[PDB]
Write a protein that binds this ligand. Structure first.
Ligand SMILES: Nc1nc2c(ncn2[C@@H]2O[C@H](COP(=O)(O)OP(=O)(O)O)[C@@H](O)[C@H]2O)c(=O)[nH]1
Lengths: 199, 181
């Protein structure tokens, strides 16, 4: 309700959003008639990227699995031809947000090989997952490394699971059980969580 | 004991079974008594040799790398997979398979348990570093080859009683089961 559009948006010859209406209307127009959902997302982005520059609010652009935007798709036409990522309006409009041509906010993102298309299982580095196009787009950027648990974090994670009584095996509380969990997971948070799930 | 036919060959005379038994019982009586050196060699004239050499795992030498760290190298084989492992005397429990961390090289939990079995058995998880190179075979065959290589290399840094225990737990035996034609 506080944010208001700065242009007239025409959904259909009958229906339009007139200048100065609250942004919520645009969102509602995408939630009621799905035909205009994708057009309603872009407008929202186009507004948030602009008004933040004016200084009305601070904008955080959080995108997980950002490596999807500059890769390949598994979507096809009716003639079974491949579709490129830039041909999707939803993906085309989100790339504009990754460009650092606006101020008043930050762009935080995370890579992910899980769910990715045409990437080997052991690819995790920024260039390898992003591609040449992705690296050129995000460049310059600040990379931040996430590693496996160090001993303190691993001990505290198992203590949290013990406090929730989530480790029911009688040998799990013991030191030998902790060493076996450490070896089998190698302090990896996801492997440790999956192993602790069924113990 | 000397068999009947070879005893005939030594004597160059045919003899029955009961007289062979008579001779063997006399030899037993001579053994039980406090037989001297002459009697000992006399008995040995009629005692053939069979060699038993189990219990003894060849303990690989402890080498030293350029950095002054002690390590031991060993080989293992399982089906068509061949592994060669270097175990370091001191470490923090890091296993490195073809230059890849062991949890990334072995996504399946069964193989990680197989890699864990040797160190866990002798209660030294997190005390050695392993650098192994495995080639050929498949997932489980490579895991088994690496397990055998690490056990045979780790036999250098354990006590002889522990070496025998690993031998009895099946951790130092090459598995010979392979696909039959
Ligand atoms: N139906 C409709 N969609 C609009 C309108 N304005 C913006 N949009 C949507 O919001 C997005 C705005 O992106 P934009 O900055 O204008 O890039 P461009 O259209 O390719 O030049 C567009 O991709 C449209 O999908 C409009 O006046 N009518």
């Amino acid at each position: 309700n506080q944010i208001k559009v700065q242009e007239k948006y025409v959904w259909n010859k009958r229906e339009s959003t007139e200048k100065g209406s609250p942004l919520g209307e645009v969102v509602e127009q995408g939630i009621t008639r799905v035909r205009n959902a994708t057009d309603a997302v872009g407008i929202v982005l186009k507004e948030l990227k602009r008004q933040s520059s004016l200084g009305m609010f601070h904008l955080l652009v959080a995108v997980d699995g950002i490596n999807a935007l500059w890769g390949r798709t598994t979507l096809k036409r009716e003639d079974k031809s491949p579709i490129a990522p830039e041909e999707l309006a939803l993906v085309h409009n989100l790339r504009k947000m990754m460009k650092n041509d606006w101020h008043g906010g930050a762009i935080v993102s995370a890579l992910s090989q899980t769910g990715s298309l045409f990437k080997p299982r052991k690819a995790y580095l920024p260039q390898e997952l992003l591609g040449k196009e992705g690296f050129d787009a995000l460049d310059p950027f600040i990379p931040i490394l996430v590693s496996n648990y160090n001993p303190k974090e691993f001990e505290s994670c198992i203590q949290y699971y013990l406090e929730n009584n989530w480790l029911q095996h009688e040998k799990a509380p013991t030191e030998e059980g902790k060493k076996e969990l450490l070896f089998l997971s190698n302090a990896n948070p996801s492997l440790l969580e999956r192993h602790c799930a069924y113990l | 004991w000397l068999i009947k036919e070879e005893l005939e060959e030594m004597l160059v005379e045919k003899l029955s079974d009961l007289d062979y038994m008579q001779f063997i019982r006399l030899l037993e009586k001579l053994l039980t008594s406090q037989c001297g050196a002459a009697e000992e060699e006399f008995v040995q004239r009629f005692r053939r040799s069979v060699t038993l050499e189990s219990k003894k795992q060849l303990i690989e030498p402890v080498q030293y790398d350029e950095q002054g760290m002690a390590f031991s190298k060993s080989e293992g084989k399982r089906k068509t997979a061949k592994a060669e492992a270097i175990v370091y005397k001191h470490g923090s429990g890091r296993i490195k398979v073809n230059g890849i961390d062991y949890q990334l090289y072995f996504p399946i939990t069964q193989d990680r348990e197989q890699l864990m079995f040797p160190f866990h058995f002798v209660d030294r998880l997190g005390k050695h570093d392993v650098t192994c190179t495995v080639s050929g075979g498949g997932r489980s065959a490579q895991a088994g080859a690496i397990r055998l290589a690490m056990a045979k290399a780790l036999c250098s840094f354990v006590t002889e009683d522990e070496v025998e225990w690993m031998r009895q737990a099946g951790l130092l035996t090459t598995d010979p089961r392979v696909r039959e034609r």
